[PDB]
Amino acid sequence: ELACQEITVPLCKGIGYEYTYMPNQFNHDTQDEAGLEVHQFWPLVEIQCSPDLKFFLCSMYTPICLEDYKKPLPPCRSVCERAKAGCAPLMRQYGFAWPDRMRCDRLPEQGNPDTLCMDYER
Amino acid sequence: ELACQEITVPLCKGIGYEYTYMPNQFNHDTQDEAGLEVHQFWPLVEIQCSPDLKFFLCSMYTPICLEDYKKPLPPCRSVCERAKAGCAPLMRQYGFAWPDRMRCDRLPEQGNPDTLCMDYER
């Protein structure tokens, strides 16, 4: 189902977990393809409008792969809400809308035993 | 391995999940043994000093067991803090301290980078 592969995307190395799987939720078949899209957020990550932006992005583009849990473990909605609250305003100021694919309501909320997610808060 | 078994402990019905595993953290080998201890909290649950008490107690004595996730999923520290804040004072009124086994400091917090934990409240 989910074949784990060591993370190679530079922006996502050493983020807390070392393996990912493909294709991801965006149908990217390789890390290089995912990297071409997520690296566009490198500047915003460096600017630090949100401490959770890098983890949020990587949890979507290079999703965590666990040999024990053969199921996707997306970031919880709370992670996205924090990233959005911190960075969406600056983005809007320069003419960037919050990407539809990053809409937080698309993610599961924390606290549901039947639909687990990562709610890491940096 | 965590072999899931349907929860039979009367006090632990209506807590948001229906399966547990044994032995639990207290080395109880069966639900009847765990039930003998957790049922001592029956009066406090009925008095409703905390809406979180029942889930908290059960998440400790009849821990959550999932078919996909094969690892202990403890309640987050926040759950314990709310239950304690709501019921500890009452217990103290009669001369009893919050049980050491239910100490909140040893539980992981929401957003921690190591272990997933459960708290229905966000």
Side-chain angles (χ1 to χ4, degrees), chain A residues 44-65:
Chain A
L44 276 174
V45 167
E46 295 284 4
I47 288 174
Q48 306 193 68
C49 37
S50 176
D52 298 318
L53 184 63
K54 189 189 293 178
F55 178 78
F56 172 52
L57 294 173
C58 296
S59 70
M60 301 204 287
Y61 287 89
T62 58
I64 187 172
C65 186

Side-chain angles (χ1 to χ4, degrees), chain A residues 69 109-111 113 119-121, chain B residues 66 68 110-111 119-120 122:
Chain A
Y69 189 63
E109 296 270 25
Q110 64 91 60
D119 181 30
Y120 168 59
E121 185 180 61
Chain B
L66 304 167
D68 58 313
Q110 311 182 78
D119 184 346
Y120 295 169
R122 173 177 49 64

Side-chain angles (χ1 to χ4, degrees), chain B residues 54-117:
Chain B
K54 197 204 304 180
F55 167 78
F56 173 60
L57 293 175
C58 299
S59 73
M60 300 285 277
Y61 289 93
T62 54
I64 304 171
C65 190
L66 304 167
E67 292 301 300
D68 58 313
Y69 195 68
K70 280 288 100 66
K71 175 183 175 183
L73 183 59
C76 302
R77 179 182 298 184
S78 46
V79 178
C80 182
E81 298 284 16
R82 291 200 304 280
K84 182 186 178 182
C87 301
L90 184 57
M91 285 184 80
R92 297 188 66 67
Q93 174 182 60
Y94 292 85
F96 300 76
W98 184 247
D100 172 71
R101 282 188 169 179
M102 300 296 102
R103 57 194 300 171
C104 304
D105 70 317
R106 57 182 289 272
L107 300 170
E109 294 184 58
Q110 311 182 78
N112 86 82
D114 307 291
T115 313
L116 298 182
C117 62

